[PDB]
Amino acid sequence: NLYFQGHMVSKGEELFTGVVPILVELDGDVNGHKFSVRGEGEGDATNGKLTLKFICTTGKLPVPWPTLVTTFVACFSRYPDHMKQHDFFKSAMPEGYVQERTISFKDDGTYKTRAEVKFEGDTLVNRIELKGIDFKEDGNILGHKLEYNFNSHNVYITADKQKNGIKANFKIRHNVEDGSVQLADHYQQNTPIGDGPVLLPDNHYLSHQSALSKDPNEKRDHMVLLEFVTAAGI
Numbered sequence: 001n002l003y004f005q006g007h008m009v010s011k012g013e014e015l016f017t018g019v020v021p022i023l024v025e026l027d028g029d030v031n032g033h034k035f036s037v038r039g040e041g042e043g044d045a046t047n048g049k050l051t052l053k054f055i056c057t058t059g060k061l062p063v064p065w066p067t068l069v070t071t072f073v074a075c076f077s078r079y080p081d082h083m084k085q086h087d088f089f090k091s092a093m094p095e096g097y098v099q100e101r102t103i104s105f106k107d108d109g110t111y112k113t114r115a116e117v118k119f120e121g122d123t124l125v126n127r128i129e130l131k132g133i134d135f136k137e138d139g140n141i142l143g144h145k146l147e148y149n150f151n152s153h154n155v156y157i158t159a160d161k162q163k164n165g166i167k168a169n170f171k172i173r174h175n176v177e178d179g180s181v182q183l184a185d186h187y188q189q190n191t192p193i194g195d196g197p198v199l200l201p202d203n204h205y206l207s208h209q210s211a212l213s214k215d216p217n218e219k220r221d222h223m224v225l226l227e228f229v230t231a232a233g234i
Contacts, residue, residue, distance in 0.1 A: 030132030048078025086201030095194030
């Protein structure tokens, strides 16, 4: 008798009832400084929780770890039941979506990132290409003057019916070691990788909270990240 695979039958938010393994791979280039990062962990969409651990595979990371948190999977957001029809990220799965950002650091350079978030086998993969230009060698970023912590932020989402996708805009505040704040202007676009229909939502926001720590037994440059994300606004 016949055998049916999980994705032959199920799609969308149903692939996220359980705990999904995550793989993150980033190839970076900032002012000609090339680096790579590999991360792995789990995502629990029912609770809006994800745990990730990142290791710089090319040695010393040339930017501070907090500047990369936003680049390092909104499909694990906790959407309340009264907002199911507005969860674009889960509806594009398993084929996934493309996430593109421009991150303009105030008084400094800009990141441009292109990421594909999709299932590879039973693993949720976030594969990123990052290009950084016009950073100051003494600035807060290349000079490693950012504190190792992260603040909570809301990501304000609007539909983009033109490109069958999503748009978002938000400011990130990085604590600087001298007591000031380094601003990171995020502009974001999301478009489905596949051709199937996707939920295009009314205006709403994702609420992000993050916790960074270290593993004292890991000698490679690394970051441990706990994130909680929930949806709200309607």
